[PDB]
RNA sequence: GUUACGGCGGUCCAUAGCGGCAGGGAAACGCCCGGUCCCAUCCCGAACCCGGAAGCUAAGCCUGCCAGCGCCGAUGAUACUACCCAUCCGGGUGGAAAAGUAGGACACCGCCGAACAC
RNA sequence: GGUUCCCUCAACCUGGACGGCAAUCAGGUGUUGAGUGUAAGUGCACAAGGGAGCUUGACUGCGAGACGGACAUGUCGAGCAG
RNA sequence: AGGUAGAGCUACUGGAUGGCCGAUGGGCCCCACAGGGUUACUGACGUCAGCCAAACUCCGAAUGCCGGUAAGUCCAAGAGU
């Protein structure tokens, strides 16, 4: 839907920590972002579910 | 030019304001201000009938001799406040001068004569700026239009001035513009 | 004249009033964090002990009395440290 | 007769440096407890000051004009280190320990950086 | 001057038919070029083989 | 008839009719003029009728100036309709006149014909007026 | 303490600006000479950076004098206005502009540092 | 978007192969008349406008003091810890 | 702290009257290109003089509003919270 809602999950513990939007035509591939994960307690890579 | 100054009587204003100037004008006086190089403002009162009498026969730039509480002062008429409808004189700015002092004065120009029959005489500049000493301001400068034909321009540089009189306004102003007489087919085409 | 048609107005919209303006005037004694001026741009710039919000709202950074000044042609809002009794 | 047509390179350098010095001043301010450290790099010498912007008065100031600094036989960078040590001694003797660096509109590096690194090594904390 | 973006720039010399010679620097990797008209040869700078076969037939 | 080439806002409030004129109260181009004495809206259909009455009385010679221009519009809504449902479309153009304002001017060689030519134009305007000159 | 001196600041940031004329290189501020060293150009040691000391005050900078352009601007009068009288006009008490006139003005104040002198 | 550093536009004049009013280049005048994703308004040349390098704070637990309000909503916020 | 009444515009955005200047074009002669001038001209740019605006402003009051202070009414406003 051009700009759908996406959810970012930690790569270590796999907890859904954030939700955001991206353009699915400008950025067709799964987003990769470093975000603070409270469960781990530090900054871990996050990937689109 | 040699001018004889005109004697006037001036009285110091007791009050000032809009409620005291209306009383003065309802009585027959005009408020005035006598400032000048002396760094000394003064709020005066002149008789309305007497002040307008000299202006009717000596132009706007008259030379006054005010008698303020017994003394004698030489003054010049700078500006006048005239009501648009009643044609009154609501105020008068007076400037103190001395003999031999050069004053920049804006005098009026009158065109006289009868040009070519098939021509129309139009005046653009009503007045020009003139520098002269305090007792030698010409009350009028005249220009003659005679034998002038068709497109012709009597620019301000051709106006003759009395000896001892300079010219402040530059010689580029167009004073009189004489042109061909408009026909009946030209009066209808204008303004529509 | 006697003939008639259909007419209407395509206007008739507006938005809610925003209540923008000066909230604390010169000489008033304020606390810390108290909103002073609400505005769109920087019509008033911050001075000493005054910050700027996300929407260009000026608040007090320290207790004191409000002062209005100018600094190189910019209208600034300042806080003076009123002395303890 | 002669008449230059355009701006000299000295004219451009002078007022473009102050143009990017005033830009720096938007955040760096000098307090009596945390003074402001000015530096004026030149093609020949270097100067520093310890400025207080609330009073508009300076407390301490070292320079390379001094006959003691000229005794060093090193290069311009070696002359900058000594200035960086002179100012630290004069600042500490005035009861000043923490300062803020105002690079003066020059690129931080070379003689500018050599002065700051010597003052950090000699007590001043910035 | 940056390292790699620029091309080669090596010394060279120029010999011309009028006996004049040069020694300059350029990008010609050969290091020497030959020029048939130069500043010295050109008539315009001095104030002033089709014909070979043309004279080889008529005279 | 005079119409401006364009105006930003086509439907405007009514011009205020208070006070006397702040400027343009003297003759600047011609030798004679018409000075207003009360407030009114002077439509462009009365300006055109006034300057033709001047032209016919002087026939050939002389020049005519008009110092007021119909900028401001007035709107009339369609006939025989109730109140409400929008605002009417502009219908005629007016010029806010205040006492003291000089409307027309004229420069003609003699006096009688020039003075009587202006009186014919006064009888076409919805106001009272008088003839004024350049002298003090 | 003195100077045609060099930095850092200020003022309800032009009364300070623009322009014209004539002048200065003691120390400093600059132009200036190079690209071996840190560093740099979306190409160029032009700029940023570094190492210097042949020439010059021709420019920046600084000093003195000009009111041509900009800037500031009274007094008084007027427009307007609060309250009050006033049967359709107007008036009284208090406040008081904008434009314009006389004029002002080629800035003033503070902390350091230089050379000379003491 | 975050942050660090650097720059001044529009318009006009003059000289240039195609090239013209108007493309890329050079010099000069130029203090905001250009531009800010998107309406208008308030701002921004000190730049919030233009360029480049590294990055994800487009966070977690909180939040003194306030704006605005019939209520339900809505808005700003220094500062502490990770 | 404003921005109304007022006023002002060569201080921005628009409207707009009359002159002067004259590029450019139009039309013509300049035997055709090129090669100089003329018009009741459409006449840009500039400039002199007089103007207009709720959605224009280089300006700009009187009142009104927020706060402080000194008093006044005070066997009363029969006040505020
Ligand atoms: Zn995790």
Numbering used by the authors:
A (entry chain 5): 6 to 54
B (entry chain X): 4 to 195
C (entry chain Y): 2 to 86
D (entry chain Q): 2 to 127
E (entry chain 3): 1 to 48, 56 to 66
F (entry chain O): 1 to 136
What sentences appear in the manuscript?
In M. tuberculosis and M. smegmatis, the Balon homologues Rv2629 and Msmeg1130 are transcriptionally activated in response to hypoxia, increasing bacterial survival and pathogenicity. To verify that some of these Balon homologues are indeed ribosome-binding proteins, we recombinantly expressed the proteins Rv2629 and Msmeg1130 from M. tuberculosis and M. smegmatis, respectively. We then determined their structures bound to M. smegmatis ribosomes. We found that both Rv2629 and Msmeg1130 bind the ribosomal A site and share several structural characteristics with Balon that are discussed in detail below, including the absence of aeRF1-like NIKS and GGQ motifs and insertions in the decoding site-binding and the EF-Tu-binding sites. Msmeg1130 (M. smegmatis) and Rv2629 (M. tuberculosis) inhibited protein synthesis as effectively as the known hibernation factor RaiA (Rv0079), causing a 15-fold reduction in the rate of protein synthesis, as assessed by the relative levels of the reporter protein GFP. In this assay, Balon homologues co-sedimented with ribosomes in the absence of EF-Tu, but EF-Tu was detected in the pellet only if Balon proteins were also present.
